[PDB]
C-alpha cells in the first residue's frame, strides 16, 4: 500500500450491549462501545424474539404504572 497518505488503521475491539465483542482492524481512533449488532437485532433473528436496552425500557419500563 502507499505510505504517509492513509489514516491510522489499528486493531480495535467493538463491544455491543448484548455481550457480542468483535475484534476488527478498523479506523476509528479509540475503543468502541456500540449498542445494536447482528446478534441483537430484531429483523435478523426474530422480530418479536429479541430484547433491547433502550427507549423501550430505560425511559419507559422503569416508570410504568400498569
Amino acid at each position: 500500500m502507499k505510505k504517509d497518505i492513509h489514516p491510522k488503521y489499528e486493531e480495535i475491539t467493538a463491544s455491543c450491549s448484548c455481550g457480542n465483542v468483535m475484534k476488527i482492524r478498523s479506523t476509528v481512533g479509540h475503543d468502541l462501545n456500540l449498542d445494536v449488532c447482528s446478534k441483537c437485532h430484531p429483523f435478523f433473528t426474530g422480530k418479536q424474539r429479541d430484547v433491547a436496552t433502550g427507549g423501550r425500557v430505560d425511559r419507559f419500563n422503569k416508570r410504568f404504572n400498569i
Partner: protein, 177 residues
C-alpha cells in the same frame, strides 16, 4: 480474513451442495466494494469536496480518488474537468474488514431499518445499495460533520446471474426483505 475464512469454508460448502458444481471457482467470488460520494454541491463550496474526501478517509482507511466530470453538462452547470465527486475501491483484506464492519454494525444502525432491498442487481449479479445516512458507519464521530450526507455502495460479484448472486449474499445472512 475472518469473514474470508467463513466464506472459504461455509459459503463454499453450502454453495457446492446447493448448486452441484463441477469446479470450486464456479461459485461467485467478490471483485471489490466501491464507496461513492456524488457530492454535486462542489460548484458552490469547493471545500465540501475535501470534507467528503475526509469522510471517506474516515470510513475506510484509504485516500479517495477525486473523481472527475465525465463530460460537460450545462443543466447541472458542470464543465469538463471539474471535480464533482470522490470514490474508493476496497478489494482484498480491506474489503473483508470493511464488509464485516458494515454488515455487523451499520446494517442494524439503519434508521427505521426494515430489511434490505431484494432487487438491486444489474441483471447479472452485482449488488448495489444506497445508504441515506452516513451515521450508521461506526467510524463516524458525528462531532465534525457539517451535513449528514448519504452514500451508495456497490458489491461487485463474479456471479453469473441474479440467482447465484442472491444465493452468495444470502449465505452471508443479509436481511433481504
Amino acid at each position: 480474513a475472518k469473514l474470508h475464512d467463513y466464506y472459504k469454508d461455509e459459503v463454499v460448502k453450502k454453495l457446492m451442495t446447493e448448486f452441484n458444481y463441477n469446479s470450486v471457482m464456479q461459485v461467485p467470488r467478490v471483485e471489490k466494494i466501491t464507496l461513492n460520494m456524488g457530492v454535486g454541491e462542489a460548484i458552490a463550496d469547493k471545500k465540501l469536496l475535501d470534507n467528503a474526501a475526509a469522510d471517506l478517509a474516515a470510513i475506510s482507511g484509504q485516500k479517495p480518488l477525486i473523481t472527475k466530470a465525465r463530460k460537460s453538462v450545462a443543466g447541472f452547470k458542470i464543465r469538463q474537468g471539474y471535480p464533482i465527486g470522490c470514490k474508493v475501491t476496497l478489494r482484498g483484506e480491506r474489503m473483508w474488514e470493511f464488509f464485516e464492519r458494515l454488515i455487523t454494525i451499520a446494517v442494524p444502525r439503519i434508521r427505521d431499518f426494515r430489511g434490505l432491498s431484494a432487487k438491486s442487481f444489474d441483471g447479472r449479479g452485482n449488488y448495489s445499495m444506497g445508504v441515506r445516512e452516513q451515521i450508521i458507519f461506526p467510524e463516524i464521530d458525528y462531532d465534525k460533520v457539517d451535513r449528514v450526507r448519504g452514500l451508495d455502495i456497490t458489491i461487485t460479484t463474479t456471479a453469473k446471474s441474479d440467482e447465484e448472486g442472491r444465493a452468495l449474499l444470502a449465505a452471508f445472512d443479509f436481511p433481504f426483505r
